[PDB]
A paper describes a structure:
The oral bacterium Porphyromonas gingivalis, a “keystone” pathogen of periodontitis, produces a dual domain sialidase (PG0352). Biochemical analyses reveal that PG0352 can desialylate human serum and complement factors and thus protect bacteria from serum killing. Structural analyses show that PG0352 contains a N-terminal carbohydrate-binding module (CBM) and a C-terminal sialidase domain that exhibits a canonical six-bladed β-propeller sialidase fold with each blade composed of 3–4 antiparallel β-strands. Structural and functional analyses further demonstrate that the CBM binds to carbohydrates and serum glycoproteins.
To probe how PG0352 interacts with native glycans, we engineered a D219A mutation in PG0352 to inhibit the ability of the enzyme to hydrolyze the glycosidic bond. We subsequently co-crystallized D219A PG0352 with 3’-sialyllactose (3’-SL) and 6’-sialyllactose (6’-SL) and solved their structures utilizing molecular replacement methods to 1.42Å and 1.41Å, respectively. The overall architectures of the CBM and sialidase domains are completely conserved in the structures. In each structure, the sugar ring of the sialic acid moiety adopts a distorted-boat conformation, with shifts in the positions of the O2, O6, and C7 hydroxyl group of ~0.5Å when compared to DANA, due to the D219A substitution. Otherwise, the residues and interactions involved in the binding of the terminal sialic acid moiety in the PG0352:3’-SL and PG0352:6’-SL structures are essentially identical to that observed for the binding of Neu5Ac in the PG0352:Neu5Ac structure. Three additional ordered water molecules are observed in the active site. One ordered water occupies the space vacated by the Asp-219 side chain, coordinating the O2 atom to the main chain amide of Ala-219 and the side chain of Arg-194. The other two ordered waters are part of an interaction network that connects the carboxylate of sialic acid to the side chains of Trp-278, Arg-398, and Gln-400. There is no clear electron density within the PG0352:3’-SL or PG0352:6’-SL crystal structures to facilitate the modeling of the galactose or glucose moieties. The absence of electron density for these moieties suggests that there are no specific interactions between PG0352 and glycan substrates at the active site, except for the terminal sialic acid.
Numbering used by the authors: 20 to 523
The structure:
Amino acid sequence: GSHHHHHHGSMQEVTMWGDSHGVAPNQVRRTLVKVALSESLPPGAKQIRIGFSLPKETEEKVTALYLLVSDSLAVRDLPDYKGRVSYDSFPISKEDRTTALSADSVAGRRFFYLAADIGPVASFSRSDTLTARVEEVAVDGRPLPLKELSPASRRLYRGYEALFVPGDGGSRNYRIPAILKTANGTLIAMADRRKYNQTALPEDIDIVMRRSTDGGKSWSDPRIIVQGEGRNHGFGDVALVQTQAGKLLMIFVGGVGLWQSTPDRPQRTYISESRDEGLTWSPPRDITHFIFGKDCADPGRSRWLASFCASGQGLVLPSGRITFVAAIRESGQEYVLNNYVLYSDDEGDTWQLSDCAYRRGDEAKLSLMPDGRVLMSIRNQGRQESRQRFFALSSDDGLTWERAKQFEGIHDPGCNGAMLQVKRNGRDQVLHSLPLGPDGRRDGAVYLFDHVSGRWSAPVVVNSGSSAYSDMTLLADGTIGYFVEEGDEISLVFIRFVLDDLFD
Ligand SMILES: CC(=O)N[C@H]1[C@H]([C@H](O)[C@H](O)CO)O[C@@](O)(C(=O)O)C[C@@H]1O
Ligand SMILES: OC[C@H]1O[C@@H](O)[C@H](O)[C@@H](O)[C@H]1O
């Protein structure tokens, strides 16, 4: 083996991880450091003592400390599992730097969490972070060597909440975030309820929703709004808009996998609408026949094989035209997709396709430029060219398109993300979310593109660690809501900040 293992007895081993998830004011029992024993305390043990450090700046930002003890080693803060992780909580005075528990209280468990209640105050700047470190773990007065696998650094954000966590509602997994703010200020968050594992269609998947009427301060209990009925009969990959008339529209796919779809046995595209801020939804309406396949009235598209609109949000233009970008498979001989805008000029009654917007594209998103042109951002699938994100422009409200290399300048490891058109210090800019990578789904970042100089900012990492799809919306009061896939086993996390918190 990699290490020498002695033969004079069993050797307890201690591992510790500092936490780097975001936090927000007033949150309860937030993990700062996690400690794992490799085996239970031995039967003759009487006490475990844990010594720790915590800088004054962090002490001033917390109201209470705790040692939590669990039989489970969890990725996220223990309250995020809503009781599915059982734990005991042992208070520590916030000024103390050591704590001890009897072996009987530990009751054979191996996992310890130095946790804190967060106070009401914060500056939210890049440097507004919380940290602690475990300095000693001693059993019956004998210290153990500690294996430190990560430092603690929890950034304070104006809002931070995991809205969908593995296990919630009985679903094993969650993926594929979509966020919408309505004109009345309601927030709708939807996701794939990946009930049996984290894999895509053709797995059996439901679509689930939560809604907030207070700007993300609190969220309704999750509701399954489309229920998968078995393998090859699931639904997922939601994108959302609100039409000019005010109805909410969700578009999604269901059925076999994208590469298994054929003209005669398609993976289908459906729409559903809500006229009451997301409280109720119409039965899914199949609109596949407007796009491709054996029921399509355009014979030039009746042999195309598959289509899916990119999850997250579409775009409703000032004219009222409703748009989403579809990525369409035109040939069964190649694993290649071409982008077309799927649009409706009659509030969703009928749907049409633009001319082709991008060859060898993938999930693509739209945003409205200051002058009325439409910018499209296209995922780079298959490490094409210089592994950069691709862009295109339309000046006819999405009907025709031309590649826009001047907008390129950020890496795309091959992942969905989102755009917001913003004004900052009097300058029109585009905010774009993507994982930084490089070449992996790590370090969820945002960048600003300055329209006038044609240059991208350095990235700002919002959520370090494993990070994948992201969606973003602008709230009424000027904050940005950023809804991201955090972790290798994904939770969908809603983070609220203003631009100056990240870029100033
Ligand atoms: C309908 C569908 O399959 N959507 C899936 C897409 C497409 O397969 C790729 O974008 C095609 O290249 O990719 C994911 O798997 C991914 O990369 O995390 C997630 C998503 O659920
Ligand atoms: O070092 C030994 C001593 O240390 C204590 O902390 C421990 O609980 C007892 O076993 C005692 O005998």
